[PDB]
Amino acid sequence: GNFISLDKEEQIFLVLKDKPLSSIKADIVHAFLSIPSLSHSVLSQTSFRAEYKASGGPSVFQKPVRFQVDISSSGIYSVTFTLISGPSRRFKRVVETIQAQLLST
């Protein structure tokens, strides 16, 4: 029972030891839905994009968070959260919410 969470810069990784790929896909999509103001799109059988609109604002400096999620195998699995645009700090809270669903078994 390993999960490992690496908050590198503008990329956050999650490494998972015994969770099947279907279950990871399910958990991520559940999380996308559950977060309100977050809409997503399917980029491929194992990657996603996502826009978190709530951090936006009237100003050009209040931008929504756009990020990408990629799942990769070796086995063991990794989920990469990659920031495309928007505030770094609200990126981490969205990603945290997402990793949280990814721990439930």
Buried-exposed string 19-52: b where 16+ CB fall within 10 A, e elsewhere: beeeebbebbeebbeebeebebeeeeebebebbb
Domain boundaries, the chain: 1-105
Burial of 89 by CB count in 10 Å (0-12 exposed, 13-18 middle, 19+ buried)?
exposed
Method: X-ray
C-alpha 39/C-alpha 36 separation (Å) is 8
Strand locations in 1-105 (E): 3-6, 11-16, 38-44, 47-52, 65-73, 77-85
Note the resolution in Å, 1 decimal.
Answer: 2.8
